[PDB]
Amino acid sequence: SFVKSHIRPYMDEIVTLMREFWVMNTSIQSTIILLIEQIVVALGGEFKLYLPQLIPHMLRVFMHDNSPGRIVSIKLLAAIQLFGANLDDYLHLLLPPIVKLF
Amino acid sequence: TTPCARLECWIDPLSMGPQKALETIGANLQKQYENWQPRARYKQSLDPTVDEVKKLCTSLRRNAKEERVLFHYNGHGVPRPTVNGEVWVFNKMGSPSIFVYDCSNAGLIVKSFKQFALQREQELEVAAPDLPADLFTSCLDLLVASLFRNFLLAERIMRSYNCTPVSSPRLPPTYMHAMWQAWDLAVDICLSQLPTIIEEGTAFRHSPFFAEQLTAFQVWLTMGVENRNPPEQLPIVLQLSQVHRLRALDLLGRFLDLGPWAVSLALSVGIFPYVLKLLQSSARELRPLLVFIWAKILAVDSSCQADLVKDNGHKYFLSVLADPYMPAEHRTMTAFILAVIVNSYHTIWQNFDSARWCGVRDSAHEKLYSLLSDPIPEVRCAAVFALGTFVGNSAERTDHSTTIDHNVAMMLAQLVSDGSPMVRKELVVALS
Amino acid sequence: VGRLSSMNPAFVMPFLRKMLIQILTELEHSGIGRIKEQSARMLGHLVSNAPRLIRPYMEPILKALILKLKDPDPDPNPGVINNVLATIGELAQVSGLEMRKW
DSSP, X not given: OHHHHOOSTTHHHHHXXXXXXXXXXXXXXXXXXXXXXXXXXXXXXXXXXXXXXXXXXXXXXXXXXXXXXXXXXXXXXXXXXXXXXXXXXXXXXXXXXXXXXX | OOSOSEEEXXXXXXXXXXXXXXXXXXXXXXXXXXXXXXXXXXXXXXXXXXXXXXXXXXXXXXXXXXXXXXXXXXXXXXXXXXXXXXXXXXXXXXXXXEEOOOSSHHHHHHHHHHHXXXXXXXXXXXXXXXXXXXXXXXXXXXXXXXXXXXXTSSHHHHHHHHHSSXXXXXXXXXXXXXXXXXXXXXXXXXXXXXXXXXXXXXXOSOOOOSHHHHHHHHHHGGGGGOXXXXXXXXXXXOOOOOOSOTTHHHXXXXXXXXXXXXXXXXXXXXXXXXXXXXXXXXXXXXXXXXXXXXXXXTHHHHHHHHSSTTHHHHHHHHHHHHTTOSTTHHHHHHHOHIIIIIHXXXXXXXXXXXXXXXXXXXXHTSOOOXXXXXXXXXXXXXXXGGGOOOGGXXXXXXXXXXXXXXXXXXXXXXXXXXXXXXXXXXXXXXXX | OOOOOTXXXXXXXXXXXXXXXXHHHHHHHHHHHTGGGTOTTTHHHHHHHHHHHHGGGGXXXXXXXXXXXXXXXXXXXXXXXXXXXXXOHHHHHHHHHHSXXX
C-alpha cells in the first residue's frame, strides 16, 4: 500500500534498502513467497531502476522455479508477476526454467 | 538553403515569463539545428497568443524556398494551448514538421491530428481543403535533461550516456566524459551509417532523400535505448519499426568499445575496426556469399565511399556489385549513391579502372543524362584514352560513346576534340 | 568448409543461442572459433554479446549454469582478440574462486 502510494519520489531512494531486506528476510518463505511476489508487483509497477536493483532477488527467483511447491500457485504468481518485472536483460536467466516449465 | 529551412522553437518554464539562461538554451538548439540548421524562432513560456503570432510569421516566412519546416515543442506543466485550432488552423516544399514533448499528449497530439485531420481531411470535401501530407509530428530521472529533445542534437552525446548506462561499461571501461573530439570525427561518420543499415534494413521504400528530414529520421532511431522506464519512452511516428533488433544496433555496441580504449589515454588511437571490418566481407556476399540477401550491405558502402577510406577497395568492391548486376544494379540505383557519389567525384588513373569499372557499369545502367557530368566525362572520360590503355578501357571508353549518339547536348564540339582522338585509336585497336 | 554466407552466421548463432543442450553450443563457439576471425563483423559483436550475456551469469545462484558458464568460457577463445581487448573475465572469475564456500 505504501509502495502503491508514492511512485517515485520516495521510491528511487529509500527502496533499495528493503530490497536488501527482502534478501534479508526470506529465501523466500512459502507464504512470504506469495507476499514478496505480490509486493514486487507493487515494486514492479514503479521503477525501471529495478534494473540496477535487480538480481539480489532475481537470484532468489530461481530458488523458486527450481524449488518449487504448492500446485504451481507460487510459480504462476511469480510467473505472472515477472511479466511485471519487465524487462530487457537477464532472459539469460529468465527463460531456462520457463522453457523447462513447459 | 544554407542552412536549409525554417524552424520553430518553444520552451515551457511555466506561463508568460523569461528566466535566467532560459534565453541561453534556445540558441543552443538553433546552433544544434544549424549543426543540422535553420531559420529558427525561439520562444519562452508564452501564453498561447504570443506563440500564435510567430507561427504566422513563419507561416509568412517564405518556405516555398525551405526544403522543410519544423514545429518544436517542449515541457510546460501540460500547456493545452490550442489542442486544435492554432495547430489545426495553421494546418496541413517548405514541408512542415511538427515536434512534441509530452508525458501523455504526444500520441494524443498525434492522435488529435488525424482526428482533427479526419475533420480537416473529410469535412473539407462537402465544401465543394486541408491535405495532410509532408506535415509530420515526431513524438517524444537521474541523468536525462530532456531525452527526445537532446536526442537529435547530441546524437552521439546521448549515445555516450547509454554507453555508460550501464552493464556493458563493465567491459569497455571506463567513463569520464567528453574530450575526444577528432577521433570522434569517425563515430558520427560511423553512427551516421550505423543507423542507415537498419534503414536500408527496414526502409521499404519510404525513405530519404530530403536531408534534415532524414537527419531526424536517423536520429529518431537513437530512441531505442528507450530503455528508461517500463514506459520505455516509445516515440510514435507515422510518416518502421523495429528499433531493438537491427544488428548494426547490437554492432555499434562494441564499435563503441573500440573507442573506449583509446579514450582512457592517450589517443593514440586512432584506427578502430569498424568501417574496415564492415568493408571486408562485403565482398563475401558480393562474391557468392549471399543468396539474393538483399546485398545486405550496399547502404554501408555509400558513406564508406565518401572518405579517402579504403576508398578504392570500396570502389573496387563497388564494381564487384556492378559485376553481380544486372539484378542488383537497380538496388545500386535504389541506393543510387553512385549518382550521388560517383558523379560527386568528377575529380582517376588507378581509380579510372574502378571509375570505369564502377562508373562504366554504372554509366552502363542505361541511363541518366550526365548533364554537366558530360563535360566532366568530356574531361575525365576523354582523358582516360590518353594512355591508349587498357582494354580495361576497351569498351569502357565507349561508355560515354553512345551518349553523344543518344541525344544532342554537344556531343559535337566537345565531341570534336574526341572526334579527333576517337577514330584515331579506332583502327589502332582493330578489335571488334 | 565455406561456412560463410551472411545468412549462415545468423543461422549459426541461434544454436549458440540454444543453449540447450549445453554442449551443442559448446561446439559453435569453437565452431565459429575460426570463423570468428574471418569477419568479426557479424561475429565479434554477436560474440561480444555472448560474454556480455555470459559474464552476468556469475552472480545468479548456483550452479549447473555457472558451470554452463565454464565450458562456453574458453570455447570462444579460438576467438582471440576480443578476449584480449577485455580480459575482465579475470576480475569476474578472479573473484569467482575466492569467495567461498557456496
